[PDB]
Amino acid sequence: NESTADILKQLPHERLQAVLEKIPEEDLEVRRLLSILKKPEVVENEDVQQRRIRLAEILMVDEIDLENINNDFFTPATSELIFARRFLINYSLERSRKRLQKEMERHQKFNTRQELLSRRTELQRMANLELAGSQLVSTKPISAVSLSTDDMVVATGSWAGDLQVLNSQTLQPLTQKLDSHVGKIGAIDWHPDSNNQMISCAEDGLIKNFQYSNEEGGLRLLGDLVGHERRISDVKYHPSGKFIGSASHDMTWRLWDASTHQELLLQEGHDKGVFSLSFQCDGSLVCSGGMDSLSMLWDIRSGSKVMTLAGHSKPIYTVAWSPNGYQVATGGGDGIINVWDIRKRDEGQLNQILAHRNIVTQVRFSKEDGGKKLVSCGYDNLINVYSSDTWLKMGSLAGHTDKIISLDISNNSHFLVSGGWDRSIKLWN
Amino acid sequence: LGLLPKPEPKVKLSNMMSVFENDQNITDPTAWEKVVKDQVDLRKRKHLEENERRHEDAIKRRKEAVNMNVEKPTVYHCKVFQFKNLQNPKIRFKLKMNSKELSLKGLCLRIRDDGPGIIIVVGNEKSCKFYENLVMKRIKWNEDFELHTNTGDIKMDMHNNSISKTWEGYLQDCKFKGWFMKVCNDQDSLLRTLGQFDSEHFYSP
Amino acid sequence: MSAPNPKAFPLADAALTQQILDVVQQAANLRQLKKGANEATKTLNRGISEFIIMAADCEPIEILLHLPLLCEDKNVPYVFVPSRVALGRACGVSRPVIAASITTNDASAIKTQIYAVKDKIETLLI
RNA sequence: AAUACAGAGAUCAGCAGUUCCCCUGCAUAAGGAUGAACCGUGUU
RNA sequence: AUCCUUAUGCACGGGAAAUACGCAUAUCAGUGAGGAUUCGUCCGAGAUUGUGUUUUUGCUGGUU
Numbered sequence: 001n002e003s004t005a006d007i008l009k010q011l012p013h014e015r016l017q018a019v020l021e022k023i024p025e026e027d028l029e030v031r032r033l034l035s036i037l038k039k040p041e042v043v044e045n046e047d048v049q050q051r052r053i054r055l056a057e058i059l060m061v062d063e064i065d066l067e068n069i070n071n072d073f074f075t076p077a078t079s080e081l082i083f084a085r086r087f088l089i090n091y092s093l094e095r096s097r098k099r100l101q102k103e104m105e106r107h108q109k110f111n112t113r114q115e116l117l118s119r120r121t122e123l124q125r126m127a128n129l130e131l132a133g134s135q136l137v138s139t140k141p142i143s144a145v146s147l148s149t150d151d152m153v154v155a156t157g158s159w160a161g162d163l164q165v166l167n168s169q170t171l172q173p174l175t176q177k178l179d180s181h182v183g184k185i186g187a188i189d190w191h192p193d194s195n196n197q198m199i200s201c202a203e204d205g206l207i208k209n210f211q212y213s214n215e216e217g218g219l220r221l222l223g224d225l226v227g228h229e230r231r232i233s234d235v236k237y238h239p240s241g242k243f244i245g246s247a248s249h250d251m252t253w254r255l256w257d258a259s260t261h262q263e264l265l266l267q268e269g270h271d272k273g274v275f276s277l278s279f280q281c282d283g284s285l286v287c288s289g290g291m292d293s294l295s296m297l298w299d300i301r302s303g304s305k306v307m308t309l310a311g312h313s314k315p316i317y318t319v320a321w322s323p324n325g326y327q328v329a330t331g332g333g334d335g336i337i338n339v340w341d342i343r344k345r346d347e348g349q350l351n352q353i354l355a356h357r358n359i360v361t362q363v364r365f366s367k368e369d370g371g372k373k374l375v376s377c378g379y380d381n382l383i384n385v386y387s388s389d390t391w392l393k394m395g396s397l398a399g400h401t402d403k404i405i406s407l408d409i410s411n412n413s414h415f416l417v418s419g420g421w422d423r424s425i426k427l428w429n
Numbered sequence: 430l431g432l433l434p435k436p437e438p439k440v441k442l443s444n445m446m447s448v449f450e451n452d453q454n455i456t457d458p459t460a461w462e463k464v465v466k467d468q469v470d471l472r473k474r475k476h477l478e479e480n481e482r483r484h485e486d487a488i489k490r491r492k493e494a495v496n497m498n499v500e501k502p503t504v505y506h507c508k509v510f511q512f513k514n515l516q517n518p519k520i521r522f523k524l525k526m527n528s529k530e531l532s533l534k535g536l537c538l539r540i541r542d543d544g545p546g547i548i549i550v551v552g553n554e555k556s557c558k559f560y561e562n563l564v565m566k567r568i569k570w571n572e573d574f575e576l577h578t579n580t581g582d583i584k585m586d587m588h589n590n591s592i593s594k595t596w597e598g599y600l601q602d603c604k605f606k607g608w609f610m611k612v613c614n615d616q617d618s619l620l621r622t623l624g625q626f627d628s629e630h631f632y633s634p
Numbered sequence: 635m636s637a638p639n640p641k642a643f644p645l646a647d648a649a650l651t652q653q654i655l656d657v658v659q660q661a662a663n664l665r666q667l668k669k670g671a672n673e674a675t676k677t678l679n680r681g682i683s684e685f686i687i688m689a690a691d692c693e694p695i696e697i698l699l700h701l702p703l704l705c706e707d708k709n710v711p712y713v714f715v716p717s718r719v720a721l722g723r724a725c726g727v728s729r730p731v732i733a734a735s736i737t738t739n740d741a742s743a744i745k746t747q748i749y750a751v752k753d754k755i756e757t758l759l760i
Numbered sequence: 761a762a763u764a765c766a767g768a769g770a771u772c773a774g775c776a777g778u779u780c781c782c783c784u785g786c787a788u789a790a791g792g793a794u795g796a797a798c799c800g801u802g803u804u
Numbered sequence: 805a806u807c808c809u810u811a812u813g814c815a816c817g818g819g820a821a822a823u824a825c826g827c828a829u830a831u832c833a834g835u836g837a838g839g840a841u842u843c844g845u846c847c848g849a850g851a852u853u854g855u856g857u858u859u860u861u862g863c864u865g866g867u868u
């Protein structure tokens with residue numbers, strides 16, 4: 001009787017088939033052992049009975065044992081930067097005081113009728129707008145366009161990362177082009193005062209301070225900024241005028257001086273990329289949007305993380321501050337715009353415009369008038385107009401054949417300039 | 430080892446003639462027709478049996494699938510649609526089925542009866558795409574139908590009625606528990622309806 | 635993982651990779667796929683491609699970094715997936731594969747999976 | 761070496777099994793297409 | 805709910821081939837095997853090297 005059973009037992013199929021019945025039977029139970037045993041949890045096509053067999057086949061070959069045996073700091077330093085914080089406080093505090101006073105003064109007049117006429121007029125104006133021309137720039141999509149404080153000149157950055165400055169009204173052709181040392185352009189910004197300088201961030205982790213010379217095409221590097229490893233997505237000038245803050249990919253937004261070209265603050269706190277930095281009009285606060293879907297406010301003067309905003313279930317590309325200074329607006333991969341006003345805090349918080357399909361790139365408030373309208377751009381090819389009171393969508397405009405990387409709007413609000421995957425720059429009325 | 434029957438030959442109406450296995454070959458000619466012809470069908474019957482038995486087993490197995498309970502997705506794809514009229518019942522019915530058919534969470538609303546309205550749907554991204562296809566390309570909202578009233582049947586011309594999508598996107602959580610078609614008389618309780626869901630904004634004037 | 639290569643961009647996540655690699659293989663069986671660098675580079679020059687998939691951890695990475703600059707001129711989406719070994723399997727190959735280009739046939743059976751994934755990928759290129 | 765011997769030494773036939781290939785079923789995976797008149801926050 | 809497509813698994817029925825089918829504590833190989841060209845370019849996965857069986861593998865039945 002022994003020799004009969006032994007030869008049967010010695011056999012590989014039989015040896016397997018005995019082992020198959022001692023292993024539990026559920027999809028989950030089977031699966032867990034696999035991942036623990038490191039082999040692929042699932043294969044191409046299989047029913048669980050086929051899955052179960054694989055276990056056995058793996059358990060057999062290695063002669064492995066049964067599932068039984070199977071199973072915050074404060075950082076010191078940089079006194080010199082410390083000096084600046086004082087400057088900010090003196091500048092910030094005064095500015096805030098002035099702003100609040102001005103806001104209050106508006107309140108007194110009331111006379112609702114005028115206002116409610118005004119909004120209607122604005123909406124009608126928005127409804128009308130159309131293309132003026134297109135134009136061209138390069139053969140890579142256009143990553144950033146910006147208007148000077150006098151609104152006479154546009155700068156256009158390609159992915160190729162070469163910037164040509166164009167003439168607002170006509171656009172035709174341009175003043176003069178430069179192919180900068182960098183290949184993929186993040187953002188381009190004007191100094192608020194002189195109209196003599198720009199700043200541009202790009203793939204190489206180097207920010208370049210440009211001197212724009214008169215009507216000359218002799219755009220001249222004033223200095224380069226170093227310290228950044230990864231690509232730099234966004235860069236801005238403090239509302240003040242002295243300081244430039246940089247925000248890139250390695251979880252470091254860096255506050256920089258214009259004059260000395262020094263690193264005033266190295267800040268941390270997001271856990272993935274940080275795709276935008278915005279500075280808020282009293283020059284008190286910077287809000288950082290990130291790829292981790294956490295909008296995080298920051299007080300420059302104390303260097304304290306203040307209020308974390310959670311609302312975006314995909315990366316937050318643009319963070320647009322409002323002129324009034326008590327509201328912010330964000331946009332993201334999720335096709336939402338959140339608008340958070342810090343004053344309410346306990347129960348007002350975020351009003352979500354549902355704006356766009358297919359992402360959002362750059363949200364812009366209207367500069368003059370304290371901020372009323374919103375303008376935003378996604379890959380939906382459309383472009384939107386929003387009230388800042390109801391946040392009802394008012395109108396949309398389609399002149400682009402492709403997606404839109406970024407857009408900036410005339411200070412008066414008689415221009416809208418939008419630039420596009422399609423490689424043109426389209427002036428909107 | 431002798432645990433198992435020694436196999437007998439397969440036989441067919443081709444192989445039939447030259448198998449001289451001891452069983453009534455030339456002797457009983459029609460008795461050997463039946464054996465092979467019966468034999469052939471018994472093999473086939475087995476093919477049919479393996480099929481039906483397997484077919485039946487899966488349906489029981491299916492019930493375990495029925496029992497399995499969702500396991501939340503981390504992100505919820507969503508859509509939103511907006512139309513002039515929903516009056517046609519055939520349209521009212523499909524929207525109830527497919528929503529229950531595909532496990533789409535969500536809601537629908539509108540103004541009174543003839544007043545326009547909105548649709549909301551949420552699920553895994555595969556589900557929405559089906560439903561989106563339905564609402565736009567399959568169903569004709571401009572089509573005409575003869576409705577039934579309490580008295581009798583009357584024509585309706587919906588040609589002016591039209592549909593278009595507003596947004597598709599992504600949301601931290603979908604507070605919609607089930608898909609609940611309803612009616613609101615005003616534009617306000619309509620908001621308060623969505624208001625319960627913190628969805629007031631999804632309506633566009 | 636290992637340090638994902640900084641030049642790797644757009645980098646697909648876990649959930650997109652499953653959706654992409656599945657399309658790859660689904661095309662392999664209709665022989666609408668093309669595997670490898672040169673085979674992929676050929677496609678763009680001709681003008682038949684739909685999108686390129688690349689290996690992120692391709693060692694060294696500089697050997698495929700030309701594809702991105704070619705894709706941007708032909709207006710063709712692209713992404714990196716996190717390992718080459720996985721991409722090797724999906725193309726039906728024993729051995730590591732660093733790039734692959736799905737192609738065009740507009741009578742195809744799988745046409746609607748492809749437009750799905752390009753729509754997802756072009757989102758990553760911000 | 762002499763001798764004793766014993767002294768020149770199976771064929772006809774069937775079925776399954778490996779290998780590709782087509783037809784037809786059921787399953788498992790992904791994918792699609794189209795149809796279903798109704799709308800869950802004081803007498804026992 | 806029907807219907808349709810591709811892949812994989814078990815399977816009835818029908819064919820073709822075994823100078824064919826494999827194997828290796830072994831060399832390379834889409835980070836390009838091996839070919840075609842109208843000379844402009846075009847296809848894109850196996851090639852070496854040692855080895856096992858190959859007028860046959862297992863299994864029954866008749867007749868002497």
Ligand SMILES: *OP(=O)(O)OP(=O)(O)OC[C@H]1O[C@@H](N2CN(C)c3c2[nH]c(N(C)C)nc3=O)[C@H](O)[C@@H]1O
Binds near residue numbers: 526805
């Ligand atoms: O076959 P059975 O009735 O058992 O199906 P289930 O009871 O398992 O239940 C819900 C599923 O039914 C399928 N149906 C059923 N019908 C009538 C139907 C389904 N699906 C569609 N589409 C999604 C197009 N249209 C229909 O008319 C669905 O799979 C449901 O999940």
